[PDB]
């Protein structure tokens, strides 16, 4: 229909609430509401996420208890920030994350309250480490198919939408759905203290403790895996000396003949762990 620039802001707590609540109830689509602030025409800013309670034991079925609305928003009024609801979410846990018939069913009833209340889909399965996968959508009408649907200001967002993407059925659901870009702004305070946590708190408390424990390893436990290393670096070696012989025998470097390889580099890296933690001994133990 009449479109605008497509842009969705986040909160950093949001994504975590999404993944936790969509993981803890995984095989059934778990309803959840979404809370934020309509700043303007084209950007929407979710700032808070609270999950919905569950009901009877069936896929995709959803409800909005209004006493839960009143009491939850009341608690968030006596919490420091009360703000306006901005939409909702659930998961499509086993697939390529398209809104189902029940999803568009609650969308045509939910769209009469808010215009740009954006439906969002988290998936805790098709993301491993380098995917969110954040996936939000927006419903189109059927009355305005006499008119066009195609102003699409700031053209980059659409061409960006077609790349994160697959299916025959998403391709069948470019009707009734046009997505919207999601991006991420991060507090440098929060970024730096998450860096504190996950580049400092993977090192452990007082920080001497586990390195002196490695120093405990280096004179009691290492010699056993050094015996394992020496037995490997005899047994693997007397047959990997057959390998340049057979390289001279068969061809100049053709296809893979069979199972084994050199594999020594990994065992040598474990020996490098041995020497570095043996270097730790002088440093820690003395002074």
């Amino acid at each position: 229909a009449v479109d605008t620039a497509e842009q969705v802001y986040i909160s950093s707590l949001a994504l975590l609430k999404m993944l936790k609540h969509g993981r803890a109830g995984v095989p059934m689509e778990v309803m959840g509401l979404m809370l934020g602030e309509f700043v303007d025409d084209y950007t929407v800013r979710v700032i808070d996420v609270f999950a919905m309670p569950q009901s009877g034991t069936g896929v995709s079925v959803e409800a909005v208890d209004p006493v839960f609305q009143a009491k939850m928003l009341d608690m968030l009024k006596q919490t420091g920030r009360p703000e306006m609801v901005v939409g909702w979410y659930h998961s499509h846990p086993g697939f390529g994350c398209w809104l189902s018939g029940v999803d568009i069913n609650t969308q045509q009833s939910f769209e009469a309250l808010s215009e740009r209340a954006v439906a969002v889909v988290v998936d805790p399965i098709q993301s491993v480490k380098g995917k969110v996968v954040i996936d939000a959508f927006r419903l189109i009408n059927a009355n305005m198919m006499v008119l066009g649907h195609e102003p699409r200001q700031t053209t980059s967002n659409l061409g960006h939408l077609n790349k994160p993407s697959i299916q025959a059925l998403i391709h069948g659901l470019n009707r009734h759905y046009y997505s919207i870009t999601i991006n991420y702004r991060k507090n440098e305070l929060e970024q730096k203290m998450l860096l504190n946590l996950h580049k400092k708190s993977w090192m452990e408390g007082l920080t001497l403790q586990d390195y002196s424990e490695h120093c405990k390893h280096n004179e009691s436990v290492v010699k056993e895996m050094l015996e394992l290393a020496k037995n490997y670096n005899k047994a693997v070696e007397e047959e990997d000396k057959m390998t340049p012989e057979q390289l001279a025998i068969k061809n100049v470097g053709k296809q893979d003949p069979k199972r084994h390889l050199e594999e020594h580099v990994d065992v040598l890296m474990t020996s490098n762990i041995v020497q570095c933690l043996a270097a730790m001994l002088d440093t820690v133990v003395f002074k």
């Binding site: 950007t43 195609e150 102003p151």
Partner: protein, 407 residues
């Protein structure tokens, strides 16, 4: 050294133009402006002490050294000399090369025959209408190309490409034949191909002084009042597309039309056209309304202000303007304001070679991807033509390192 170089040009050699292509060498590989002027200023002392009359070299140093008094000196001498044939080249290459502050500051020295000549040479409109006359008498185009690219009909953004294309191939011709031949295909897209059409009208009319306002009086917003917002908002934008680089009654025309207008649909073309006609001219009284255009607390007119707030102050680095821009674009909640003022703070600094670096380090510093991208545009614009390898290091370095795609 200056004076042993003065000794080498005071020799017993047949030198037609070694003192011209060595000046090309002086312009090509120069380290700083601290040494270019030290070479250049005594060369024209020996040129005005040379027996043969030579005007291309004093013209060269004149447009280089940016002196609003030496041009008036030699122009006074050539108008006193009573030959307008030799007081021709200096005057029109003078109008061609340099900036608006230079000509508009030497115009006082020219009115400190001789009164009509400065109007002939410093207004310089007639050269623009001469090439415009070349553009209307010379029409080598094709409609069949637009037929082939016309009957590939899609209701998409493609309308904007078609109207910008037939404004491309019909620049400076002042002919609305694609408003003659069809009327309903133009009226297919909403508000945005319509702004693009009413601005393509201005693209057809670049450098067009005579029939400008009376040709766009069809689309003045106070009489017809179309239901489309940017359609009535695009007239002043097309006027600014006409009268770019020069200020006339367009400044005093839009200056009260941007006060009493509609809501923030008309300011987007108005301030763009007003700072486009006043581009590089450092007009304070458009910067004044650009201040409230900045503080409208809206970013769709924030981009109006974001373009124009740099456009009016090209190459000036008004130290309070940098403060205004970066001190409004930190606490804002939008992004169009950020990117418009990004372009603006890039545009205000232009050809400084060292003087932008205090700002460049600050714009490199911030966690904002928009503002790092802004520093990239600023180091792009302050170093136009700079073969110096100061910018390229951090430039291509953050082209390696940074995580946003647009930066």
């Amino acid at each position: 050294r200056l004076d042993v170089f003065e000794k080498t040009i005071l020799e017993s050699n047949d030198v037609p133009g070694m003192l011209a292509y060595s000046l090309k060498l002086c312009m090509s590989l120069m380290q700083n402006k601290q040494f270019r002027n030290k070479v250049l200023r005594v060369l024209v002392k020996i040129y005005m002490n040379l027996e043969k009359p030579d005007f291309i070299n004093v013209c060269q140093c004149l447009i280089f050294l940016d002196d609003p008094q030496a041009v008036s000196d030699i122009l006074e001498k050539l108008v006193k000399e009573d030959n307008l044939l030799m007081a021709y080249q200096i005057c029109f290459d003078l109008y061609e090369s340099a900036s608006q502050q230079f000509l508009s500051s030497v115009i006082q020295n020219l009115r400190t025959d001789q009164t009509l000549k400065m109007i002939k040479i410093l207004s310089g409109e007639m050269a623009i209408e001469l090439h415009l006359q070349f553009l209307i008498r010379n029409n080598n185009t094709d409609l069949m190309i637009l037929k082939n690219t016309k009957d590939a009909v899609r209701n998409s953004v493609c309308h904007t490409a078609t109207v910008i294309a037939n404004s491309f191939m019909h620049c400076g011709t002042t002919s609305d034949q694609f408003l003659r031949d069809n009327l309903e295909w133009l009226a297919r897209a909403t508000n945005w191909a319509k702004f693009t059409a009413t601005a393509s009208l201005g693209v057809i009319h670049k450098g067009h002084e005579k029939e400008a306002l009376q040709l766009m009086a069809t689309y003045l917003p106070k009489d017809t009042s179309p239901g489309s917002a940017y359609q009535e908002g695009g007239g002043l934008y097309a006027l600014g597309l006409i009268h770019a680089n020069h200020g006339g009654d367009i400044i005093d025309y839009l200056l009260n039309q941007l006060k009493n207008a509609s809501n923030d649909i008309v300011r987007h073309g108005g301030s763009l056209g007003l700072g486009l006609a006043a581009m590089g001219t450092a007009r304070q009284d458009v910067y004044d309304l650009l201040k409230t255009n900045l503080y409208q607390d809206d970013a769709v007119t924030g981009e109006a202000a974001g373009l124009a707030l740099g456009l009016v102050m090209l190459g000036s680095k008004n130290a309070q303007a940098i403060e205004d821009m970066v001190g409004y674009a930190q606490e804002t909640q939008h992004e169009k304001i950020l990117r418009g003022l990004a372009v603006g703070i890039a545009l205000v600094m232009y050809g400084r070679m060292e003087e932008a670096d205090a700002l460049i380090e600050s714009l490199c510093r911030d966690k904002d991807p928009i503002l790092r991208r802004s520093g990239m545009y600023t180091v792009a614009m302050a170093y136009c033509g700079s073969g110096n390898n100061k910018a390229i290091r951090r430039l291509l370095h953050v082209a390696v390192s940074d995580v946003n795609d647009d930066v």
